[PDB]
Amino acid sequence: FRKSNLKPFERDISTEIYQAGSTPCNGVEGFNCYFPLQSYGFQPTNGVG
Amino acid sequence: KTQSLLIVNNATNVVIKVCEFQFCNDPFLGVVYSSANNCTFEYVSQFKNLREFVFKNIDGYFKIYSKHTPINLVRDLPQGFSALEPLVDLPIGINITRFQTLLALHRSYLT
Ligand SMILES: *[C@@H]1O[C@H](CO)[C@@H](O[C@@H]2O[C@H](CO)[C@@H](O)[C@H](O)[C@H]2NC(C)=O)[C@H](O)[C@H]1NC(C)=O
Ligand SMILES: *[C@@H]1O[C@H](CO)[C@@H](O)[C@H](O)[C@H]1NC(C)=O
Ligand SMILES: *[C@@H]1O[C@H](CO)[C@@H](O)[C@H](O)[C@H]1NC(C)=O
């Protein structure tokens, strides 16, 4: 999840909560709120892609 | 919370770091401070004075242009013409929206 797009060759390292509504998020993912990073699922029993 | 840049002269070399700093309210150097957490880039290299600088931030690069000249006027900027050569082309890759100057002070109030 990200607010706006990126410019060329600039990176984003900021582990802070990003709100998807007018209600505030303060460290807690409760009121229609998520974490801006979620990991992968790399299993050997998968197809290509 | 986001990454910052810092250029510091110690009267013998140049320190350039892109670490995550939690700053003061008035930072300075006592005739000193730079925090450190989770960085990428680090660089080390080498009134009648007048030094001029130009900073640009385009396409993930940080352009710096420089020129020094001996002025001998009182309190203004001169009138002639002199062009500024390129200095360095650092690949820092951050977002820069504000800036602030670091002077040499005495009263070591670290806020
Ligand atoms: C670089 O930083 C600036 C300042 O933090 C960001 O500008 C903000 O953008 C949001 C929308 O994305 C606005 O709601 C704010 O008002 C802006 N703040 C200021 C001070 O202008 C900018 O988005 C950042 N760059 C990128 C690519 O995200
Ligand atoms: C900056 O200069 C001081 C002079 O006392 C020196 O001790 C220090 O090592 C220099 N900084 C770096 C990063 O080398
Ligand atoms: C920087 O990385 C270390 C280990 O990789 C981690 O413990 C720390 O939280 C990170 N700091 C950030 C992302 O500000």
The CA distance from B22 to B36, in Å, is 9
Residues 6+ apart with CB under 8 A from B46: B13, B14
Is the minimum distance from the CB of B66 to ligand 2 under 6 angstroms? no
At A31, is the secondary structure helix, strand, or coil? Answer: coil
Q: Report phi then psi at A14, rounded to 5.
A: -155, 100
Q: Which residue has the tokens 């352009």?
A: B63
Hey, are the CB atoms on B94 and A9 less than 8 Å from each other? no
For residues B4 and B62, is the Cβ–Cβ distance under 8 A?
no
Query: Alpha-carbon dihedral of residues B12, B65, B42, A6, nearest 10 degrees?
Result: 160
Contacts of A8 in chain B (CB under 8 A): 59-60
Is the minimum distance from the CB of B6 to ligand 3 under 6 angstroms? no
For residues B66 and B85, is the Cβ–Cβ distance under 8 A?
yes
Strands (E), chain A: 18-19, 33-34
Q: How many helices, marked H, and strands, marked E, lie in chain A?
A: 0, 2
The CA distance from A26 to B98, in Å, is 25
Separation in Å, CA of B109 to nearest CA in chain A = 29
- CA-wise closest residue to B63 among B83, B41, B92: B92
- CA-wise closest residue to B61 among A34, A48, A7: A7
- CA-wise closest residue to B97 among B33, B4, B1, B27: B4
Sheet-wide strand order for B50-58: B50-58, B61-69, B85-90
Q: Which residues lie across from B96 on neighbouring strands?
A: none
For residues A3 and A18, is the Cβ–Cβ distance under 8 A?
yes
Is the minimum distance from the CB of A15 to ligand 3 under 6 angstroms? yes
Q: Which amino acid is at B98?
A: R
Strands (E), chain B: 6-9, 14-17, 29-30, 42-45, 50-58, 61-69, 85-90, 104-105
Is B109 touching A (CB cutoff 8 A)?
A: no
Q: Which residues lie across from B15 on neighbouring strands?
A: B8, B44
- Structure-token pair, residue B9: 């002269």
Contacts of A7 in chain B (CB under 8 A): 59-60
Give me ligand 3 centre to Cα B24, in Å: 22
The CA distance from A14 to B36, in Å, is 15
For residues B106 and B31, is the Cβ–Cβ distance under 8 A?
yes
Buried b (16+ CB within 10 A) or exposed e, B19-30: bbbeeeeebbee
- Structure-token pair, residue B32: 């000193």
Way the structure was solved: cryo-EM
Specify the DSSP class assigned to residue A6. Answer: P
For residues B45 and B14, is the Cβ–Cβ distance under 8 A?
yes
The CA distance from B57 to B89, in Å, is 10
A12: left (phi over 0), alpha (psi -120 to 50) or beta: beta
